[PDB]
Structure formats: C-alpha cells, structure tokens
C-alpha cells in the first residue's frame, strides 16, 4: 500500500527494472514542482499546481499504455504498481471507458461540485466552442481549466 519501502511492502515483480528510470524522470520533476517558489500573482500560483496535475496525468498514461496498449508488462507488476501508488487507479478506470479516454482528472467530470450544470468546458470539444463563438465570431474565450490547465480533454481533439 504505502509509497515508502516500509518493510511491510513486497519487493517489485520482474519487469520493473526496465521502466524504473523512466518513472524516476517524473519523480525528480515532481520533487522540483513542489519546492515552493515564491510567486506573488494569483494567476501564477495556480499555474504551479497545473504542473503537478500534469505530471500526475503523464505518469499514469505511461503505466496505462504499457499494460493496456502495448501489453508490455505483466499483470502482477501492474497490480503492484497500483498498490505503490505509481498510478491512479480511479483515473485509469475512466481511460478504459468510452468517451473519457483523454481525460484530465476525476475533478473535471464532477457533476456535483460545479455551480450550475457540470463538467468543465475543459470537456467540451474545440470543434463546438468555435461554433458557438462563430455565432459571435469572437474566436471564443477559453484557455485553461481553472482546476488543471487543460485544453480539450474531450476525446476527439
């Protein structure tokens, strides 16, 4: 269960050595994502978090593709990568569903939390937003999900 190598934890299955450096290159980035730069602007402060949410997204796709695309890792090792929290299980479970393949986060599909309606505009296809903008011809206004920094999770884009 724990990320730490606490004596309770089980030693890694076979194929882990091959992907070990590739994961660490995410790990040493995260250590540098949280170091607390001092940034005054409120527009910058969340832009720092947008680095973590991405590095968390990017590390799970790596584990998702190996097993569920390239089939390049054993099911023992994968089940062990989920315990150790190198991959977010509930996120990956959306990646297997239809329509959700490229999703940011589990927060972006939260129906509840958002004030009216639901599901960040971050989930709306660019192809569409251009068109409701087309009525006004204003080249939209959308750039980044306030939770994430996403632009178009929706799996067409």
């Amino acid at each position: 269960m724990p990320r730490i190598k606490t004596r309770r934890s089980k030693p890694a299955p076979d194929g882990f050595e091959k992907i070990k450096p590739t994961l660490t290159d995410f790990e040493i980035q995260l250590r540098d994502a949280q170091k607390d730069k001092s940034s005054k602007l409120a527009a910058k402060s969340n832009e720092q978090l947008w680095e973590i949410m991405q590095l968390h997204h990017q590390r799970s796709r790596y584990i998702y593709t190996l097993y569920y695309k390239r089939k390049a890792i054993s099911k023992d090792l994968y089940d062990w990568l989920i315990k150790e929290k190198y991959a977010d299980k509930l996120l990956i479970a959306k990646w297997r569903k239809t329509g959700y393949e490229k999703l940011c986060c589990l927060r972006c599909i939260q129906k509840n939390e958002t004030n009216n309606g639901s599901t960040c505009i971050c989930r709306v296809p660019r192809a569409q937003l251009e068109e409701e903008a087309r009525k006004k011809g204003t080249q939209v206004s959308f750039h980044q999900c306030v939770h994430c920094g996403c632009r178009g999770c929706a799996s067409t884009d």
Binding site: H57, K102, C104, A127, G149, R151, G152, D157
Partner: peptide
C-alpha cells in the same frame, strides 16, 4: 464534421494531449 477532418485537425495543437496549447 468528419473523422479525417478532426484527426488531421488536432495535430495542430502544440503538445499532444490534452495540455497541448491550441494556437
């Protein structure tokens, strides 16, 4: 719209998915 139109169309975004910047 059409599938080919979208598939070609996306690579326009700078960095894969989905953090890749449109424009």
């Amino acid at each position: 719209f059409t599938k080919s139109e979208l598939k070609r169309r996306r690579k326009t975004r700078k960095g894969d998915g989905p953090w890749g910047s449109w424009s």
